Amino acid sequence: GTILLDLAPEDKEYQSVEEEMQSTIREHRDGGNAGGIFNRYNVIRIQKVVNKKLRERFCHRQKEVSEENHNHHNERMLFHGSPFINAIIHKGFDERHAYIGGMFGAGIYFAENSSKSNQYVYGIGGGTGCPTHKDRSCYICHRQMLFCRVTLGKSFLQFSTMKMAHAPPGHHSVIGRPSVNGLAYAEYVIYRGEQAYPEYLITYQIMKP
């Protein structure tokens, strides 16, 4: 199954992932209630997720989407936060765990901003926070998030709630675009687990300002 390769802090690949993560911290409307109060992370390690079977499923789907999208799979690197990160790195993303109540329905959701994904690391609205101290703004406990290859293909642009079970006809993803009366930041949604690969596993802490 899955093998985790350690990236060295001196390598360009580690430094690239960390800078995407650190540079995309945004101020959130909840004033940090969900993800905590911070302006920076302390990155503990960065591992590359290797899984032959998961990679094969992802690459086959990229070929199918490409055939339906003028020979482009339209891949983006995006963040994902979830309390089920262990299941994802071993079994892959799974749309069967997605439920229809989400803003864009039963999809798998990603963000270009790491601080958005940091809000979901411990669950719904940050849940009860870290397992040891029950603190959503814990500065001690190691959190984990993924920085994923996401196959978007033909994206359907959406501004308001649209509870879908699958991608809209003739499309492969939904992009929830920001709007004055809606989202502050874009969110990217897929409806098939094989349209995302959990490429990097980031272990980190949020830092006290």
Ligand X SMILES: C[C@]1(c2nc3cccc(C(N)=O)c3[nH]2)CCCN1
82 touches ligand X by CB under 6 A = yes
Q: Which is nearer to Zn ion, 82 or 173 (CB)?
A: 82
Distance from C-alpha of 111 to C-alpha of 133, rounded to nearest angstrom: 27
Paired tokens of 54: 């998961």
81 touches ligand X by CB under 6 A = yes
Q: Which does 106 bind (CB under 5 to 8 A by kind): ligand X, Zn ion, none?
A: none
Nearest CA to 192 out of 177, 171, 178, 162 is that of 171
User: Minimum distance from CB of 126 to Zn ion (Å)?
Assistant: 12
Can you give the C-alpha Rg of the chain in angstroms?
A: 17
Distance from C-alpha of 85 to C-alpha of 200, rounded to nearest angstrom: 11
Residue 133 is labelled as binding a ligand: yes
Q: x-or-dash pattern for ligand X, window 92-131, by CB under 6 A?
A: ----------x------xxx----xx--x-----------
Q: Quickly count: other Cβ atoms within 10 Å of residue 70's Cβ.
A: 9
Residue 130 is labelled as binding a ligand: yes
Residue 141 is labelled as binding a ligand: yes
Residue 140: how many CA atoms within 13 Å on its side-chain side?
7
Nearest CA to 190 out of 85, 76, 89, 53 is that of 76
130 touches Zn ion by CB under 5 A = yes
Distance from C-alpha of 20 to C-alpha of 31, rounded to nearest angstrom: 22
199 touches ligand X by CB under 6 A = no
The amino acid at residue 135 is D
Q: Among 44-52, 64-72, 74-82, 141-149, which window interacts with Zn ion (CB under 5 A)?
A: 141-149
80 touches ligand X by CB under 6 A = yes
148 touches ligand X by CB under 6 A = no
Residue 59 is labelled as binding a ligand: no
138 touches Zn ion by CB under 5 A = yes
Of 10, 27, 70, 132, which one interacts with Zn ion (CB under 5 A)?
A: 132
66 Cβ contact list (under 8 Å, min separation 6) = 72, 73, 153
Distance from C-alpha of 39 to C-alpha of 192, rounded to nearest angstrom: 33
Strand partners, 155: 173
List contacts with Zn ion (CB under 5 A).
130, 132-133, 138, 140-141
Residue positions in the annotated binding site?
Answer: 130, 133, 138, 141
- Known binding-site positions for Zn(2+): 130, 133, 138, 141
Which residues contribute to the site for ligand X (CB under 6 A)? 79-82, 102, 109-111, 116-117, 120, 187
